[PDB]
Design a protein around this ligand. Structure first.
Ligand SMILES: CCCCCCCCCCCCCCCC(=O)O
Ligand SMILES: CCCCCCCCCCCCCCCC(=O)O
Lengths: 57, 59, 59, 256, 268, 256, 57, 268
């Protein structure tokens, strides 16, 4: 049950991986998880703030 | 093991009314206790028991 | 009392009063001397963590 | 199969078990519920503590002797200092609740006696001096029970309650107290007595400090007796559970 | 996965889940929602570490012994028996009968002995371990013919690499390994009493194939058992007392448990 | 209708009646049956005596005193000299059987006490001298019961059993003996105790003289007590019934 | 003849295994066998006991 | 992949992207094409090295300790705690709560000690490392029975090959490892204050299985942690100050930053 995924290559190829142990805590690190959501910290306000609008009106 | 961060509580027993007996009967009785676990009970982290011990190999 | 069958007996007699205590111990199923040597306690010692509800039956 | 003698009652984190009990008495046919919208008066939103207030509170025990006239308890005052029920009734202005009273007395097959347990609504009591009205320390004793007398209380210039028992303090005939919700504890048959009284009043809610809605009376119509050799100390225990308790009018703590 | 608590409410009924009778030898199956009000909880805990395979399948040292490259004690012998180490013995005795495969691992380590011999320049040591089933010949000396291992299983190991390890199948003339035996060997009800009666497991021998050096060297071998594919029957209570010998269940009477100050004290 | 207290057991030409009994304990969930063909080893044809061997044999009674540590019986040895069961087990080489143990003790409503009845499989016992193993005259006493001790047995150079009771002779904690099939005789509730143990062993059959498969232990966790004027002699009786007994390997009579 | 099974992972991934020896006594331990049946010990009585019922009637 | 700049032109409007109000606790989301004219740029840069898994999944030395083959210090013990090394501690304390698997690697290295003993010819050294979870027995001496590891995890390593390495799952009675704890152990609000309250991780012991030689030898063990499958919550500011102890957050007051000459100076 091999898993084929894509390699980290430049911009402007695949690799194969097999799990050998029955404990999921032995697998390799989850390196490719490029998901970001800065909205919890940068803009935590109750009311939406349009950029091109007076913050206080 | 003993850990304050995970303290369990206290179990106590009290007299509600009294033990009442007639004449020619013993006013002293005994109670017995049995402990067991329910369906939700679980255990983790297998380790060695601090009860058994030995100084030299038995023969 | 640990060197007899009296350790398992909880004495309850007729009391000329009310609301006094019979016994008490902490909810430490594997560390307290009341519980560390019972089947539950014995099995618990081989592990580090426990979870779930407990049954105490009184006869 | 099952029997009618055994019965368990669960409320909050409290369970009451009995193996020799008579049928439960439910008030005037009514089960305690909450106040509806077509019957309310106070406009703000009430708070229902539920499990924290609707549970079994046990009181002190009293000893049943061969010459005990009887005891009584003003129900709302009795619990005014127990757990979160007392605190909620101390921080609020109006309250509403029904009750579940369980009275317990156990003895052997060689003991005899009979106790009347009656929940009397609005048991207004009289004073020994016709001139005045009785004190609050005489009428309601919290954290304890109030004892009746076998002989009439003397008159004078005081504020004592007329605790004569055959008059029930209310100036009536005691044998008629079976017009109210009641239960008999007969030592040869009964073991305990349960009564589930709903909220009785002429207003939708009431202040719980200056008014006592009901009263628990325990009277031994037939005296306690036994033969030399049997147990001589026989106590009586009372456990009260509030039901559908709600509170309205949050204010500062106190009763003045 | 453990059971999930069911949410309950207030009750006033003739049902009696709390009241039972313990004289029937039956454990009450009461859940917490029978004596109080509860909430619905979604339990996700697993009972995956309480399994007998997980509880017993871990390597344990059951014995270790020494031999030398010169002098008198030139080889080591050990009748196979796990009841010398307390830990694994107490784990197995939880049940009356067991049935498992075995995984053997050997940790062989040498040490140089103090002496006055000079110009010592040792070559790598090779060890031989040999298993003799009950009935076969035994090595009266170190350079005897029995070490030819024509049929007897044996392992050659050169010091410096991975420890030797083998797999042993369930070897028993019966249907299960008996942890306890209440009887004798002879029909005359005298002689050997107890589990020593069923201990017909063979013998393990160990030696140096070469001497290595001109100076003295002592090699210690540690044996490790690891049960696999475990089956077990009829659970028993734990030992409580301290073990005394390897062939019998003899003990010294001990108190039920340790004490406290009163029946109301919340402290050990 | 019928009650759960009353129960009759018929085996052979023997009927046991009881009017105050707890539920029957059936082994490890298994009912004693015969050996099947896919599980047998000995090739010849076995003999099943049925009614002649599967019936109730009563043993001697023991007296329950206020200071009795307890008793035990090696089940196979106990009946090795009774009726045709003993004869069949004396003329054959291999045997196989389950059991039905009924323990009886009756007392009044003014007596108290509690006895633990436990069928322990492979109860290997220990010696008072760590150096040796106990004698067969110490371990198994036929036609009688073997008594426990309240104090530890002294050491020396003998072959005595370590009959200390709180250690159960097996060097364990006695309160854990409820891991095996068991039943409690409580004088205020119970009257007798029934246990239906099947054939437990690691081989399909066994010689019945040099090996004891199970053992009956009777221990009074709560002592016997009464007040002056009531009966002082209280006996305990044990009745064992073999079930599905079969024999293989006919030979000359004897055990050597 | 590879055997693909599921790994032991938390709540709220697969692994591959091949047998190399012809003796079944050489395989890995049977770790994932979560089957329990406490009824042989907790309730071994002949007659069923309903929980919300008087044990003695 | 980072966002791509949008090309803009000259504007004359009542829109005010630059003017904002910072008292609302909100960061302005202004792009450069709001205050100037820009060109269209196709950005190809990736944020693949700023991920918490990439930032934290690297092995770090958290401790090292010594033991000997003779004399007094015959074994080594260490209550597991990462707050002894500054680097990994400061990396983790970026967040309030974390949750990760662990990858342990051990670098064991021996050295010969100065002495006057002659004719030294050492055999290969084997080491044992043993983990005791909180509650189990401890090795009072070097040749005690606890080293049988019947249930306790342990690793046997012979000097000369690949360093030993294992995987540890997220071991916590809670839902996350707390890097900071603002409270006490006792309900009486006295006693142990701080994160030492939640440090119930077990103990690690290390020894030589054989002595190897007749002369003295000291072995040092270095422990390396490597978080895997990391989750983190509630980011905090960096330490700034220098650490003092391993059990608390005590510090010595330090200036906000380093200085310069004036408010107009372009030099450190
Ligand atoms: C080259 C070395 C080979 C060694 C082979 C060893 C085979 C014998 C294994 C003995 C296992 C004993 C298990 C006892 C179990 C029990 O009764 O509790
Ligand atoms: C044979 C050696 C086995 C070693 C097993 C070690 C298991 C314990 C690991 C401890 C991890 C501690 C993580 C702390 C994280 C934190 O709170 O910041």
């Amino acid at each position: 049950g091999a898993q084929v995924s894509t390699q980290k290559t430049g911009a402007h190829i695949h690799y194969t991986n097999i799990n050998y142990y029955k404990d999921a805590a032995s697998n390799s690190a989850n390196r490719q998880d490029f998901t970001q959501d800065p909205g919890k910290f940068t803009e935590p306000v109750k009311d939406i703030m349009i950029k091109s609008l007076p913050a206080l009106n | 093991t003993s850990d304050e961060y995970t303290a369990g509580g206290f179990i106590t027993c009290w007299y509600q009314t009294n033990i009442v007996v007639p004449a020619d009967a013993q006013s002293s009785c005994y109670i017995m206790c049995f402990v067991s676990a329910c369906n939700d009970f679980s255990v983790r982290l297998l380790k060695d028991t601090p009860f058994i011990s030995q100084q030299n190999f038995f023969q | 009392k640990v060197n007899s069958m009296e350790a398992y007996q909880i004495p309850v007699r007729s009391n000329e009063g009310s609301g006094t205590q019979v016994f008490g111990f902490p909810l430490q199923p594997g560390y307290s001397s009341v519980f560390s040597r019972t089947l539950l306690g014995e099995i618990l010692n081989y592990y580090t963590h426990w979870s779930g509800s407990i049954k105490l039956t009184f006869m | 199969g099952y029997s009618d003698r055994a019965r368990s009652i669960t409320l909050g984190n409290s369970t009451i078990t009995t193996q020799e009990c008579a049928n439960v008495v439910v008030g005037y046919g009514v089960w305690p519920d909450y106040l509806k919208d077509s019957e309310a008066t106070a406009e703000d939103q009430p708070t229902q503590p539920d499990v924290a207030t609707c549970r079994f509170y046990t009181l002190d025990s009293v000893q049943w002797q061969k010459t005990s006239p009887g005891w009584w308890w003003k129900l709302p005052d009795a619990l005014s200092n127990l757990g979160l029920f007392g605190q909620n009734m101390q921080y609020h202005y109006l309250g509403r609740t029904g009750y579940t009273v369980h009275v317990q007395c156990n003895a052997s097959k060689f003991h005899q006696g009979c106790l009347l347990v009656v929940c009397v609504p609005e048991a207004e009591m009289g004073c020994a001096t016709l001139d005045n009205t009785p004190s609050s320390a005489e009428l309601l004793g919290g954290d304890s029970a109030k004892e009746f007398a076998d002989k009439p209380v003397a008159s004078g210039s005081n504020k004592l309650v007329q605790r004569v028992v055959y008059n029930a303090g209310m100036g009536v005939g005691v044998g008629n107290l079976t017009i109210f919700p009641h239960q008999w504890i007969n030592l040869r048959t009964n073991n305990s007595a349960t009564i589930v009284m709903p909220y009785t009043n002429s207003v939708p809610m009431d202040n719980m400090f200056r008014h006592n809605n009901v009263t628990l009376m325990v009277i031994p119509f037939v005296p306690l007796d036994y033969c030399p050799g049997s147990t001589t100390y026989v106590p009586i225990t009372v456990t009260i559970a509030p039901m559908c308790a709600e509170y309205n009018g949050l204010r500062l703590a106190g009763h003045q | 996965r453990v059971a999930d608590t069911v949410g309950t409410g207030p009750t006033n009924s003739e049902a009696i889940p709390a009241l039972t009778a313990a004289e029937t030898g039956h454990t009450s199956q009461v859940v917490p929602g029978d004596t109080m009000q509860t909430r619905h909880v979604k339990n996700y805990h697993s009972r995956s570490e309480s399994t007998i395979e997980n509880f017993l399948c871990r390597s344990a040292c059951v014995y270790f012994t020494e031999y030398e490259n010169s002098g008198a004690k030139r080889y080591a012998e050990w009748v196979l028996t796990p009841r010398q180490a307390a830990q694994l013995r107490r784990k197995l005795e939880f049940f009356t009968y067991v049935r498992f495969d075995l995984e053997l691992t050997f940790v062989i380590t040498s040490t140089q002995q103090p002496s006055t011999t000079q110009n010592q320049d040792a070559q790598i040591l090779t060890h031989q371990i040999m298993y003799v089933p009950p009935g076969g010949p035994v090595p009266d000396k170190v350079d005897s013919y029995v070490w030819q291992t024509s049929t007897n299983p044996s392992v050659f190991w050169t010091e410096g690499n991975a420890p030797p390890r083998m797999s042993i199948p369930f070897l028993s003339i019966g249907n299960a390994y008996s942890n306890f035996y209440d009887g004798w060997s002879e029909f005359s009800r005298n002689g050997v009493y107890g589990i020593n009666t069923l201990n017909n497991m063979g013998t393990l021998y160990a030696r140096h194939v070469n001497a290595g050096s001109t100076g003295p060297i002592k090699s210690t071998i540690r044996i490790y058992f690891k049960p696999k594919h475990v089956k077990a029957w009829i659970p028993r209570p734990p030992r409580l007392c301290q073990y005394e010998k390897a062939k019998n269940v003899n003990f010294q009477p001990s108190g039920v448990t340790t004490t406290r100050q009163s029946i109301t004290t919340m402290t050990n």
